[PDB]
Design a protein around this ligand. Structure first.
Ligand SMILES: NC(=O)c1ccc[n+]([C@@H]2O[C@H](COP(=O)([O-])OP(=O)(O)OC[C@H]3O[C@@H](n4cnc5c(N)ncnc54)[C@H](O)[C@@H]3O)[C@@H](O)[C@H]2O)c1
Ligand SMILES: NC(=O)c1ccc[n+]([C@@H]2O[C@H](COP(=O)([O-])OP(=O)(O)OC[C@H]3O[C@@H](n4cnc5c(N)ncnc54)[C@H](O)[C@@H]3O)[C@@H](O)[C@H]2O)c1
Ligand SMILES: [Zn+2]
Ligand SMILES: [Zn+2]
Ligand SMILES: [Zn+2]
Ligand SMILES: [Zn+2]
Lengths: 374, 374
């Protein structure tokens, strides 16, 4: 029907930095061997997408952004055995080939098939499936979900519960899993511990959720926008602090509130100064600090090695440390079992065609997650 | 006898930086209620003592250095209950007050009573027990072991096996414990993993021993002094490489030898470039890098947060993460049960009077650990 044929649809293309997305008519090639073409149903707006627009996260242009989403399999290529047409799925910006050193290591998830580190803007075979007015369009982190139809590698697509509400579970595609996992899986927050969370957007709030789920005694939420505090409290924050209210640097305020520092700190903003503050705020002898935020391209931190010699542990992670393919289905299963809710994270719902308004909402600081419906 | 009296004894005093130690008579005050005066038997020469001489590690002068040692208790304060005159003990440069947040924490060891962070060069009560030519002399990390007699706080001295050969077990006071601990307790090296060890001095070779004890499949010893290779191999290194032998950076040489990088890397030198090579040489997705070497004073590293974001863990530790007072006696009991050997680490034994000569040996790279006899 459309199987084996090229599909003509709409997609939000970014042709230039700092410019609005352009809803364009695009051609989506049929899926090659071990590939899956997906009809998108819902896509969340994550700060990382915006990082590309602003120039903070470098990627080849023109490109179709979007990586937090959920859809339904339209067709599959030769050899596909994990999903079938009609299956509800969530694309994985961090693939899980299952065969590489990293996929085989129980404690890691940054699969060697990824396109995050040194962006090619292509699928795993090094080619593109998108075209627009005679111009090829680059993919984004292997998924390009801001399109009515996208084609992805089989190891970058997870099959989920058939009764799943895609307009909600799409957050498991990035935001929620990243934040939740950063606390429960990466930092391995312990019951009775003290945590400091920098940044209260969709990812940071999911970190607050993770810390509460891990049984943290104190979860101090840090954010320069006091409007983000109510939600942080509802989700588990015991205290909310605004750096702008203090004469002292935020790390010193945090250390004074916590007997020398927190046991676990998380930077969920993407700024060098806040990464430094987060490291400095965890206790020098027993603190752990996790970098979640994506820093601006080519910018380096200035760190004194003594900060680590006394006993600190500094680490970072992509997608909360979750091995994508095996984890996403389980997270959806937990959601269906009502282990956690994502309603608090969805502040706005807009049709895909109003993607620009969704980004305006993010930039304004009012929204957490705006979900786009196709 | 000497109990309750001032003792005039020989000590090695450092009056100025980059100058030989001055061997002379000093007056050592009796210990206070919770202090212990120790007659030194053996003291090891560690690179950290040299860091003070060179100016790399800042501490107030004039000072009596030394921190890796073993002696016999001459007298104790009336409040002392853990050691008695005649007991063989090892002074702990990292104390274990047992009452602070850190001492209560089963996973940390950087007791808040330490004098490592911002050196006062005194005992815990803020005063000094040393005088020479009338002038007060500063202590070093609360222990100052380069003296025939020293006075230390009770929580900074551990009672060890009475049958212990002090000329060997003094290494448990720093070098060995630090190296072994860094691998087994800090990095928590796992069976079948790959490790890279930067620096093959007494501490680095002990890290090799720890990696071996942990069952590492590969232990790549790195050093620009090829004379250290035979011993690295004897202690467990599977391979030995010299950075100077290659045209490309050592981190790339290591990554090419280990499928993208080692699982665990350790810097046991104290230089910025090697701390960077060490971080860069562990796999970006599953590697853990431990800082053991003491960095040069007032110097920063320039790091791109993405090095951590992909999945690396970067941490540091003091004294191999061992809670000093409870661990030192057990480590000696292990030595006495022949669970590990220290012979290979001791390459030179000189009388205390030849301390300057022992330091020249370290500087020339001709020795691993030189032990001084009193
Ligand atoms: N590691 C990953 O795999 C991963 C995954 C998803 C997102 N991210 C990154 O996580 C970060 C957060 O994503 P988000 O979608 O939640 O973004 P967001 O913009 O919705 O949230 C950012 C929050 O940070 C707060 N903030 C900004 N500057 C601050 C400062 N100086 N001090 C304290 N708070 C400040 C903002 O007010 C906002 O509440 C971004 O950098 C994103 O790129 C990383
Ligand atoms: N964390 C701690 O608690 C702790 C404890 C003890 C010692 N230390 C520190 O550990 C480090 C090692 O102590 P040590 O006594 O074993 O010192 P050492 O001088 O005996 O050993 C240093 C080794 O590194 C090698 N080396 C020096 N520069 C190099 C370079 N650029 N590239 C490759 N190899 C190089 C030297 O040849 C030597 O083999 C020192 O910085 C010391 O201050 C720290
Ligand atoms: Zn893989
Ligand atoms: Zn995202
Ligand atoms: Zn030492
Ligand atoms: Zn203590």
């Amino acid at each position: 029907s459309t199987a084996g044929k090229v599909i003509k649809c709409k997609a939000a293309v970014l042709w230039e930095l700092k410019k609005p997305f352009s809803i364009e008519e695009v051609e989506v090639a049929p899926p090659k061997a071990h590939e899956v073409r997906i009809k998108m149903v819902a896509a969340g707006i994550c700060r990382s997408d915006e990082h590309v627009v602003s120039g903070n996260l470098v990627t080849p242009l023109p490109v179709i952004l979007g990586h937090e989403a959920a859809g339904i399999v339209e067709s599959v290529g030769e050899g596909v055995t994990t999903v079938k047409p009609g299956d509800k799925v969530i694309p994985l910006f961090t693939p899980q080939c299952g065969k590489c050193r990293i996929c085989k290591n129980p404690e890691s998830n940054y699969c060697l098939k990824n396109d995050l580190g040194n962006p090619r803007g292509t699928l795993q075979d090094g080619t593109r499936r998108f075209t627009c007015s005679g111009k090829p369009i680059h993919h984004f982190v292997g998924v390009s979900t801001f399109s009515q139809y996208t084609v992805v590698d089989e190891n970058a697509v997870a099959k989920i519960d058939a009764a799943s509400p895609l307009e909600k579970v799409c957050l498991i595609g990035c935001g929620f899993s990243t934040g939740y996992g950063s606390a429960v899986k990466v930092a391995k927050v312990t019951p009775g511990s003290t945590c400091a969370v920098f940044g209260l957007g969709g990812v940071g709030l999911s970190v607050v959720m993770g810390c509460k789920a891990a049984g943290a005694a104190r979860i101090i939420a840090v954010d320069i926008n006091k409007d983000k505090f109510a939600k942080a409290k509802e989700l588990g924050a015991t205290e909310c602090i605004n750096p702008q209210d203090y004469k002292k640097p935020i790390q010193e305020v945090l250390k004074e509130m916590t007997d020398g520092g927190v046991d676990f700190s998380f930077e969920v903003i993407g700024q060098l100064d806040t990464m430094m503050a987060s490291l400095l705020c965890c206790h020098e002898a027993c603190g752990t600090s996790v970098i979640v935020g994506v820093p601006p391209d080519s910018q380096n931190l200035s760190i004194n090695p003594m900060l680590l010699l006394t006993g600190r542990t500094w680490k970072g992670a992509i997608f909360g440390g979750f091995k994508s393919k095996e984890s996403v289905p389980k997270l959806v299963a937990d959601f269906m079992a009502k282990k956690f809710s994502l309603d608090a994270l969805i502040t706005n719902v807009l049709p895909f065609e109003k993607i620009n308004e969704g980004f305006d909402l993010l930039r304004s600081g009012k929204s957490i997650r705006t979900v786009l419906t196709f």
